[model samples]
Target: GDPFGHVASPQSTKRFFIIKSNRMSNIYTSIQHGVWATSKGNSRKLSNAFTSTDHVLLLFSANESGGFQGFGRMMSLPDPQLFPGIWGPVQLRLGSNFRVMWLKQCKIEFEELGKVTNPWNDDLPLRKSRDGTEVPPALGSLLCTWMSQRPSEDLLA
Candidate 1:
């Protein structure tokens, strides 16, 4: 009647009986269970395992200050070469689409270097695109036209 009939040890028989009591339910399942789990992705969700969306392609990491590191990491150009911070409600263009960002932060610290350039206010919320239901490049698009238009530290060039 016993599966391991050859093993006559009582302790071994007792150990095999309480199989799953030794392990956590989440990790290291039996082979058959694993195959079904891998083959049927949504089965676990259907069985009340987890809540998740299907999928998406793009992903971005947070910036230096740990804010929304912007968006299109690939399309990002230097802020100075770009719009350079247009105060108040302004349109940030990519190719054709532009986002309406309100003044989020625009201030000058006395200790901080660099002159507070024109077209910029000396206060916070200098520009913030509060426009909802909108998506575009994180820092907008490159406004460079001519070869020299885009600033470069490429001294050889």
Candidate 2:
């Protein structure tokens, strides 16, 4: 049985009485709950808990604005030199927006410089990938790769 004791203070009696009532049940019954737990576990593993300051680059879909959007952080940008494909480290469970939230907790100042009005509607025509050819790096991926390498201390200030 898990020790389900609740301490009144940080320092309290080492052995506390457990509730005798047996209304407890496994909470991982729903798919949504499992998904949320998986996401949280991933976030905990990837994110630095002791040091809240970390550089995160967020790339949002052109249409997404305001509130929480399901935007993912790029692990790596496309690298032409690395051959047809190159990828960064592990994909974090928490998205770019969540990263912003974490930064805000550290009281770091961040401002939106400007928005690309027609980022998606670019002049460059979408081209299919050719054999031995690689796709252009995602803009967000490029930014994240650059930022992640910077010192976390710099982010604190």
Candidate 3:
């Protein structure tokens, strides 16, 4: 095996985040291409919370009970220099008030994992879904397994 495989490298404990979006349809393709963002000028904070290797679950908030559409890893925090001229077109759809980061898609439709009535701790303040709601390891592992078993195909419209 590679020496750095188990040693200090890019590998580390993966933090899980669940981000909600009412306009999933609009950004579906972009997400599939490994990009997500936050609005309300909190993208900087969000970027800070989301390290490069953190995993994220996209929640289709337009549904009655926000359903997890798919999962992916955050490849990088928001950095204009790292992703120059990329946010221009995306910002148009997401509004100029948003900041973006890279993702590594492992997407699947909501039907694949079905619904989870309660996935996170009740005290976990999630009034702002765009900022992302972190989940416990129990729920995080459960979701991790769900996406791993499914095909990484685009189904959301």
Candidate 4:
């Protein structure tokens, strides 16, 4: 989770960050779940708009206690580029922790987002078993499943 109170909104844009380490898997982050200060000052509402993948700015931070005074890298991507970690082509490994923090959900629209249907925070219900019966408790999320890019919906109004 992006417990760090940091935003990847460099170059004056709306962004957020999520943390993941080599002790885990691909770090998937949703931009809609984040908030920010409008007008880019020390004020305003908690909502901001992020439009496309090209404009999703992300920065790597070491410690939040350091505030915005530390050195963070802006890992913005080009259109044809796919950096690995989560929705990326570069697999980040920082300080033997293999951790990274960045911002992205997808480059879709508001009305388009309405059509998204998937599992939630901790409810990845199992698919039908071979015998079509129930299973044990739950599986760990960190070491399971491979997900593709959330497709953009073109049929939105």
Candidate 5:
């Protein structure tokens, strides 16, 4: 039964952005998924990489049915250390019109001048249920990350 009058299965989508720099490289990535409503919200995962000249970002999303979607992007930094490492308090903004649940599994990696590469991982679960027992017909998750030499850079620039 297609209540929405559309295909009734979960879907996933992704987008990427890149920046140019003379000093270093930076990369970023994000993934999103659609799924049936759940107390755990939408599930999202993200990763980042940095080098003396550039950085990388990787993000992945998956539905409760085990379907997966992923996206990746790279950015260059004017000064690697100026905005080094996984630069985010990545955000997932749920629409007020819908009852939504959001969750995240994040892994960050960094390498010091003389130290070995290390990673820190954390899992965050966010949930928002509608006021009534009648759940919405669908649920969606949008994952986004912003990285730039400075915060003033337009997202697509």
Candidate 6:
């Protein structure tokens, strides 16, 4: 099912971005499935910003996990041909029109992110960012370090 070429090594990746998941049902289903999507509003920007080898952090709905949920790397570009239209509840909820696949899926709950300060005191802009925003250098380093130290459940493995 993967049309993409070989996966990139960890050392080759430097850029990191945040991807938001608005689905309220179960985010695990998409993680296991490997396909992810973003809305048409920011689809173009995200497509250009996210490419193979770049790391991504998944942000769950404000009411659900309410924080970072998973870490993964982009495996494919946003291809509308692959997902011509929304087909499932999760997709519908996300308003996901452009689709892509990501690998090295690792679940990281909000609790694992440690304590948060307040509405504007956290190291990362957890509340102000939209999907496709690049992770800041400092916070990116922290996230990369935390993910590497933890156990990863590789979906492709």
Tell me the spans in candidate 6 whose CA falls farther than 4 Å from its real position. 1-13, 24-26, 51-63, 83-128, 153-157
Candidate 6 per-residue lDDT over residues 19-138, each given as its tens digit: 665553334555555556766655655555555334434433323454555455544566655554444654554434433343334556656556632222344535445566666545
Where does candidate 5 stray beyond 4 Å? 1-48, 52-59, 63-65, 76-157
| TM-score, model 3 to reference | 0.55
Tens digit per residue, CA lDDT, model 2, 65-129: 22111122212222123211111121133222121111111111112213322244352221211
Q: How many clashing pairs in candidate 1?
A: 15
Give the 10-residue window scoring lowest on summed lDDT in candidate 1: 13-22
Strongest candidate by lDDT: 6
Question: Comparing 3 and 4 by lDDT, which wins?
Answer: 3
Off by over 4 Å in 3: 1-11, 40-42, 51-66, 81-131
Clashing pairs in 2: none
**Candidate 5 structure, TM-score to reference:** 0.18
* TM values, all candidates: 0.13, 0.19, 0.55, 0.18, 0.18, 0.58
Ranking by TM-score: 6, 3, 2, 4, 5, 1
lDDT of the structure predicted as candidate 1: 0.18
Model 1 lDDT per residue over 56-134, tens place: 0011111122112111111111223333333212223212111211111122221232231212222223122121111
lDDT for each residue of candidate 4 in 42-67, tens digit (9 for 90 to 100): 11111121233222222211122111
Models sorted by lDDT, best on top: 6, 3, 2, 4, 5, 1
lDDT for model 4 comes to: 0.21
Q: Local error of candidate 1 at 23, Å?
A: 37
Scored against the true structure, residue 58 in model 2 reaches a CA lDDT of 28
Off by over 4 Å in 4: 1-11, 23-73, 78-157
The C-alpha RMSD of each candidate to the native structure, in angstroms, is 28.6, 20.7, 6.4, 19.6, 20.3, 5.5
Q: Which structure is stronger by lDDT: 1 or 3?
A: 3
Question: After aligning candidate 5 to the native by TM-score, how far in Å is the CA of 67 from where it should be?
Answer: 3.7
